[PDB]
Amino acid sequence: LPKAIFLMGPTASGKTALAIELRKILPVELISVDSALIYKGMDIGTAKPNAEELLAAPHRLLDIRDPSQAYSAADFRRDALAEMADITAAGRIPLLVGGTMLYFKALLEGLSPLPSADPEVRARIEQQAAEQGWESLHRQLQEVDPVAAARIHPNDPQRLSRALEVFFISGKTLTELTQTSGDALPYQVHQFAIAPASRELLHQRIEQRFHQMLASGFEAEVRALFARGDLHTDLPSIRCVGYRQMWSYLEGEISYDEMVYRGVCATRQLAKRQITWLRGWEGVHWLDSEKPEQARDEVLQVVGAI
């Protein structure tokens, strides 16, 4: 029953700022919960904390992967669980910060044990999609696993592929394996979420931030990655907001102004979904991004003196 804290929220909501200020009055250790902040070489477009901030409040799970190697909610849970052990062992409290809700979820509720990605069976699945389309595959999932087929739309290639893969590797069906639940988070968690008071203020912060990045050398950053010649748009790292658009720009597929428009929109759409996650998330205490930055107090009281 050790204690732990979750500081969630959408992009540009001031989560990072709040976390280090918290480090000041609480015996907490910061753990990053961000699918993009894991990449080495992706610092400005991901809004990664700078070296000074990191000096004040160290973050675990940052720069732990090369943009060419995919991560997963499963890998995060493992790494996260291990980092928490180490932290609580030191008599301090784990403060998980980020905007990647699926990771928070996988960590909190666990994950049904399932086979990991198998590049070979995926390549085959992709192959059959090009020849017969994803419909042929969805009709096949329909035969072996109807429960999953009803949930997964025939237009959802990632989930469709995933449901077939599990079956092709184990022979066991996805709905059958998911009947076994994953290990819940053996911690007492206090979940907070911070966001601006209105959707429009969020949009302004998003657009403004995107320009601060361009002005901080974002383009050059993405070019360094473009120059490696080994990264492609089917990699989680390149599909990240901002990066994907900038990649289209370096490929000469779109103009600069077009890239800036799409990156901003892409970031707003991301925020929209993040808010969808938080809405209905159980046990969430809401805090305000805007000036009520002194929301640390609401944290101080909910978690109480430790």
Place this chain on the structure above:
RNA sequence: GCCCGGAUAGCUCAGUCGGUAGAGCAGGGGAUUGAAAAUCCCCGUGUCCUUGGUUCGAUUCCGAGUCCGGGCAC
């Protein structure tokens, strides 16, 4: 100044053989089990620029005006 194209949803544009119109994108909402900053599902009434003409009826054809891209001329 003259000629040729545009002018229709927040933006880019389709369309209406004359019977008041629809895609994409933007935006909104919802899903979410080893790619998740990903992948996918649902939501489209707008003085069809203005004004005359013809017409039962015009955003739609014709005339003129206005604004916007070009071209010719100085």
